[PDB]
């Protein structure tokens, strides 16, 4: 995953540096439990940094067993665009390792990969390598961070 947290820090940096001169519209997308049919859209339990009328937040579910998104994802993205707001920030739920569905409908895609992955050279077989803007890893409370950073940089150089 990786939502919210980095979004939290980004939002705080934006507000603190530009004195809240930008209107951010953020939409999150969450998966749906296939068995009971329900869902748990628990991502606004995170940062309270939406407390400003100029900034809007909205949560949505996948609604689908096949994809991670609803049938109107690009349409709702354009609908968010049409409000003459400063910026659109969209979360992208979670699938396994073969999903890149958000790219064809987004200009910038900030990607994040979990520190707990080990996989000394399995990032190579991981699909989403040369399809993003900037690498992101959190939770440096564990060791081997320098090694993982170096290997990621080398793979990015190769790709």
């Amino acid at each position: 995953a990786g939502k919210s947290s980095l979004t939290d820090e980004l939002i705080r940096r934006f507000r603190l540096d530009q004195d809240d001169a930008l209107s951010i519209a953020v939409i999150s997308i969450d998966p749906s439990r296939r068995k009971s049919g329900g869902a748990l859209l628990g991502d606004r339990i995170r940062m309270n940094a939406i407390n400003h009328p100029n900034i809007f937040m909205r949560s949505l579910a996948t609604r689908e067993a096949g994809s991670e998104i609803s049938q109107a994802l690009p349409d709702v993205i354009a609908a968010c665009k049409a409000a003459r707001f400063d910026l659109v920030i969209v979360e992208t739920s979670g699938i396994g390792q073969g999903d890149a569905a958000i790219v064809p409908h987004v200009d910038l895609s900030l990607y994040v990969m979990t520190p707990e992955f080990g996989a000394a050279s399995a990032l190579e077989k991981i699909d989403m390598l040369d399809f993003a803007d900037f690498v992101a890893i959190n939770k440096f409370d564990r060791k081997g961070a320098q090694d993982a950073w170096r290997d990621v940089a080398k793979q990015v150089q190769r790709n």
Binding site: R44, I45, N48, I50, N51, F56, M57, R58, S59
Partner: protein, 79 residues
């Protein structure tokens, strides 16, 4: 989550345009809180949302019934 601002709660609900509001207030003194919630809701035409409360046995039946008549659908008793 818990200990969330009333103004924040209502504003977020208008942001998400939700169907119901669930609150567990076992701390007491819920009368002013719920009255403020109801007034703020009726301030901006969001009456479609439903209100249900739970606070244990703090509310006597007459008091909770009066608040219910003010517009909240129910308050769920423990017993």
């Amino acid at each position: 989550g818990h200990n969330r601002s009333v103004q924040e709660v209502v504003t977020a609900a208008l942001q998400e345009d939700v169907q119901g509001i669930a609150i567990s207030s076992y701390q007491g003194g819920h009368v002013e809180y719920f009255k403020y919630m109801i007034d703020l809701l009726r301030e901006h035409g969001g009456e479609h949302i439903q209100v249900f409360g739970g606070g244990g046995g703090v509310i006597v039946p007459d008091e909770i019934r009066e608040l219910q008549a003010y517009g909240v659908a129910r308050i769920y008793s423990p017993e």
